Amino acid sequence: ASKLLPGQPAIDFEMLDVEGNVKHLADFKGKVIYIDLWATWCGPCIQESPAFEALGKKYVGKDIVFLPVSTDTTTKPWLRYLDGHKKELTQYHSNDVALKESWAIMYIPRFILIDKDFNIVNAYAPRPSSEEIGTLIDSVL
Amino acid sequence: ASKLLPGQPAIDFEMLDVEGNVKHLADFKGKVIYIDLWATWCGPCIQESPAFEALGKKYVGKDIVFLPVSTDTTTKPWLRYLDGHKKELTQYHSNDVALKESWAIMYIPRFILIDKDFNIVNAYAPRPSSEEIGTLIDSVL
Amino acid sequence: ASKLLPGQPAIDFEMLDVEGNVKHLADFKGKVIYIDLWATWCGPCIQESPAFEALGKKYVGKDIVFLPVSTDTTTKPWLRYLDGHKKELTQYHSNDVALKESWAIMYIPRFILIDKDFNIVNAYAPRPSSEEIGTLIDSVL
Amino acid sequence: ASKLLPGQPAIDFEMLDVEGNVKHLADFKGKVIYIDLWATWCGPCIQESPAFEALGKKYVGKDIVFLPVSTDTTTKPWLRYLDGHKKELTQYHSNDVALKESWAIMYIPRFILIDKDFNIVNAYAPRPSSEEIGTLIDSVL
Ligand SMILES: [Cl-]
Ligand SMILES: [Cl-]
Ligand SMILES: [Cl-]
Ligand SMILES: [Cl-]
């Protein structure tokens, strides 16, 4: 569609933390938001996890949040996975219908970059291991 | 584990066709079996589909079967996907527990190669777009 | 750098066809230009070739040119490769210093998208097999 | 061919270290040998470097050597790359004709696994980031 063009308002969705608190994407409004949509059985998604974590470490304390969002059909394999593989970033999970119907999340790995105005920078953002992601992030920070 | 070593007997599992008939992996005993475990939301899995189909075309009429097996949690998005994307190979689907607990299918894309004796050639077989898969298949044919 | 930002003028470079005629990127000014920088020993580059060719077929007769540009250190393995693997798109080759020093081509696979004004749309464009490339191309056509 | 089948003797080749000393693959006879054939402009090759290094760290002091071997046409961009990107593994470089003509190294990324008897385990070995490489390495150690 065209509601995903750069400059278009980001579409809010809800997500759960590992403690079960519901959060909203809009809660992070005012910060650059880089989203990693992954699932526990997606090999290539997990291959981007070190880069995503490393980016999260590099930009710690800057006005950007890195949101790893599991799209696992159910919560339990997500929590079991996290139990055996430590991560540093705060982890989220979502089956919000808005992912499929507003963000057009048809395939993963999928990355999304949103600016401080809560507008889309790239709805199909470069992967965290790409050579250009840092430069892109710096441009919007 | 070690029940997945080459030479080990292949582990049977059941799968559904698009008409709903239950089939067994063991039904293909006597033919080389090359399995593509994919899901409709796995981008990198779908990226291997042209190569898998092309291989299926090249070896048509040889004593080998190419089994694309969806691991989608439910049947409906699998059928909807197939509705919009034609394929030539006969399509299957499975949530058999044996996939996770005997074949150790933890991540996809995942490929499996079994010989005519129904023994494992490689439980973590090369991808269909790899340079060596044809040679490997020819070795076991 | 920042001479690669979207909206920045594209940087011209020269390229050879298989007949040895020198062409310039600027020769295609007025058409959308989608560039595939590859090399004969780059496996993942060649894995994008069917998608690049398929795109070239889909947009045939539209005001867009698809430029596969080999960056092989020398011409001979490029011609030998082409001899054994037919393609439909007109093939080019370049070792122009502008690739490394103006376009920052440090790694391949690398794709570039330029608009009809000869301005950069994305200097690190999505791969031809990506779900969003068609939509991106359509936006600039 | 068939001189690359598992169980076939490994084919020796020469390689340079960063100090310029010529070494031979056969110098490592008696140890498991896992080879990473990469080049400085191969993006996907460099994406496997953290996994290759991590494996090297995990098996430190075991009877296995991890050989990163640059296939860059010339030595200078290899040394310049290494200058700006630190690594822990001892680095090698090779343009030995045996790579192309005996090991059939046509595309990279390419990995090779050899046993203590200096026999081929897999001439097209799994990538270092694959789920099965550790198990494979353990089987031959
Ligand atoms: Cl998507
Ligand atoms: Cl798996
Ligand atoms: Cl590049
Ligand atoms: Cl190769």
Answer whether A44 sits within 8 Å of B109, measured CB to CB: yes
How many Å apart are CA A112 and CA A131, to the nearest integer? 16
Write the burial class of residue B86 (CB in 10 Å: 0-12 exposed, 13-18 middle, 19+ buried).
exposed
Query: Chain C contact for A97, CB < 8 A?
Result: no
Nearest bound ligand to the CA of residue A106: 1
Nearest bound ligand to the CA of residue A40: 2
- CA distances, C7 to each of C2, C36, C97, C121 (Å): 11, 20, 22, 6
Task: Name the β-bridge partners of B66.
Answer: B34
How many Å apart are CA A78 and CA C76, to the nearest integer? 51
Q: From the CA of A48, how far away is ligand 3's center (Å)? A: 19
Interface partners of chain B (CB pairs < 8 Å, 3 or more) are A, C, D
- The 8-class DSSP code of residue D95 comes to -
Query: Chain C contact for D4, CB < 8 A?
Result: no
Q: Do the Cβ atoms of A81 and A40 come closer than 8 Å? A: yes
Partner-chain residue, chosen from C43, C50, C131, that has the shortest CB–CB distance to B50: C50
Crossing angle of helices A49-58 and A133-140, rounded to 10°:
40
Contacts of B131 in chain C (CB under 8 A): 43
Query: Chain D contact for C106, CB < 8 A?
Result: yes
Q: What is the token pair recorded at D26?
A: 């056969």
Q: What is the torsional sign of CA C19, C25, C31, C35? A: positive
Q: Do the Cβ atoms of D105 and D37 come closer than 8 Å? A: yes
Q: Which of D42, D46, D129 to mutate to test the interface with A (most CBs of A within 10 A)?
A: D129
Q: Tokens 């582990």 identify what position?
A: B11
Catalogue all structural domains in chain D, each as residue range(s) with its CATH number.
1-141 (3.40.30.10)
Query: Chain C contact for A7, CB < 8 A?
Result: no
Residue A10: which residues within 8 A CB-CB, separation 6 or more? A25, A33, A114, A118, A119, A120
Phi, psi dihedral angles at C87 (to 5 degrees): -140, 165
Answer whether C107 sits within 8 Å of D71, measured CB to CB: no
- Reduced to 3 DSSP states, what percent helix, strand and coil does chain D have, rounded to the nearest 5? 30, 25, 45
Query: Chain C contact for D97, CB < 8 A?
Result: no
Give the strands of the sheet with C32-38, arranged side by side.
C22-24, C14-16, C92-93, C64-70, C32-38, C110-114, C120-122
Experimental method: X-ray
Contacts of C129 in chain B (CB under 8 A): 47
